[PDB]
Amino acid sequence: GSRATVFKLGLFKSLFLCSFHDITRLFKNDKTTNQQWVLAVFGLAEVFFEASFELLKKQCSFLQMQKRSHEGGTCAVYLICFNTAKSRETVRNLMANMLNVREECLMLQPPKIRGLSAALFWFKSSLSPATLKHGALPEWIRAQTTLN
Amino acid sequence: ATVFKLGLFKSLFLCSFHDITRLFKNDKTTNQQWVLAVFGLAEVFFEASFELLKKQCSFLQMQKRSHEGGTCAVYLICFNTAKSRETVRNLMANMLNVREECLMLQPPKIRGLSAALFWFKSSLSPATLKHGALPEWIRAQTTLN
Ligand SMILES: [Br-]
Ligand SMILES: [Br-]
Ligand SMILES: [Br-]
Ligand SMILES: [Br-]
Ligand SMILES: [Br-]
Ligand SMILES: [Br-]
Ligand SMILES: [Br-]
Ligand SMILES: [Br-]
Ligand SMILES: [Br-]
Ligand SMILES: [Br-]
Ligand SMILES: [Br-]
Ligand SMILES: [Br-]
Ligand SMILES: [Br-]
């Protein structure tokens, strides 16, 4: 359980300088499946962030990961494109176990696939040397960030 | 390649895997204490396994070494609950992101001075990862009575 709180949203915004709501859309039912997911994780240890990259690569067509932190806390964000569609219930169980964290430490919703500022969040992230990347960029990001 | 695994282990750790373990021929026999050797393991998984095993063990001692011939990590694990080789094999292959053929598992040789001293010597290295109190069979054979 535990979707999110004013405190988790507040920390995300203080670190990434934009709302978690501006890069995702809403799935109110925990059973609806989807290949693409946006994941935010608070209080994650570095060794598990790095191990998750190698493990997700084997079941994904695309993956982009980054992390930030300051005196108030830490937050890692993932754009995941699974080879097979999964529900929030399933992804929640997979990632809490994989990352060695409580479910309350996560926030999960599918991506906002229409909107230029939303597509530029990922394009900007792909320009950092620290970002971990795997696979070909999703067409919805490529199409909105190209043509002049 | 078992003949070559054994050779790599001795080359790196200075003694034979057979001299620090005893034999369990049946993969279903359960036991709390296990000795594990892993070949070709990545560093990030070695470190992550220390944090995950602490959660279900009363004692743990781990080491990892390498050279142009290859890499090997050795573990003395004391689980809270007794487990069979089948069960430990499945657990660790998945935890470490390696094929089961990359592991060697047997219970420890609990009687013999040279075998107890392998663990005592390992505990003196600053590189060794440790958790919990040393097993009584090691403490008793390596202390002046
Ligand atoms: Br969630
Ligand atoms: Br917000
Ligand atoms: Br919506
Ligand atoms: Br829904
Ligand atoms: Br929708
Ligand atoms: Br989508
Ligand atoms: Br935090
Ligand atoms: Br949308
Ligand atoms: Br549409
Ligand atoms: Br909009
Ligand atoms: Br921008
Ligand atoms: Br797409
Ligand atoms: Br074995």
Side-chain angles (χ1 to χ4, degrees), chain A residues 47-48 50-51 55 58 100, chain B residues 44-45 47-48 52 55 97:
Chain A
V47 65
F48 287 96
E50 288 169 50
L55 296 173
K58 49 191 189 171
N100 194 39
Chain B
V44 63
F45 285 98
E47 290 180 61
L52 295 179
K55 299 192 300 182
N97 197 33

Side-chain angles (χ1 to χ4, degrees), chain A residues 49-130:
Chain A
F49 172 79
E50 288 169 50
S52 70
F53 176 59
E54 305 304 325
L55 296 173
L56 287 165
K57 279 197 300 194
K58 49 191 189 171
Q59 59 189 304
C60 294
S61 70
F62 174 84
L63 173 66
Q64 200 200 73
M65 295 165 53
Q66 67 192 116
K67 197 178 193 180
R68 291 180 181 191
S69 65
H70 64 202
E71 317 62 59
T74 71
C75 181
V77 294
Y78 297 51
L79 170 55
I80 312 171
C81 299
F82 292 105
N83 283 323
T84 291
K86 303 180 188 299
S87 69
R88 181 184 288 106
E89 302 192 322
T90 297
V91 176
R92 192 178 256 165
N93 168 280
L94 170 67
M95 301 308 295
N97 184 60
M98 189 192 283
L99 305 178
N100 194 39
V101 298
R102 284 173 296 107
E103 306 195 320
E104 289 64 57
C105 299
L106 319 174
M107 285 211 290
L108 281 156
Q109 291 292 1
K112 169 154 175 61
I113 62 176
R114 193 65 183 174
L116 176 60
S117 302
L120 287 168
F121 177 82
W122 308 107
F123 182 77
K124 182 174 184 175
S125 294
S126 81
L127 300 173
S128 175

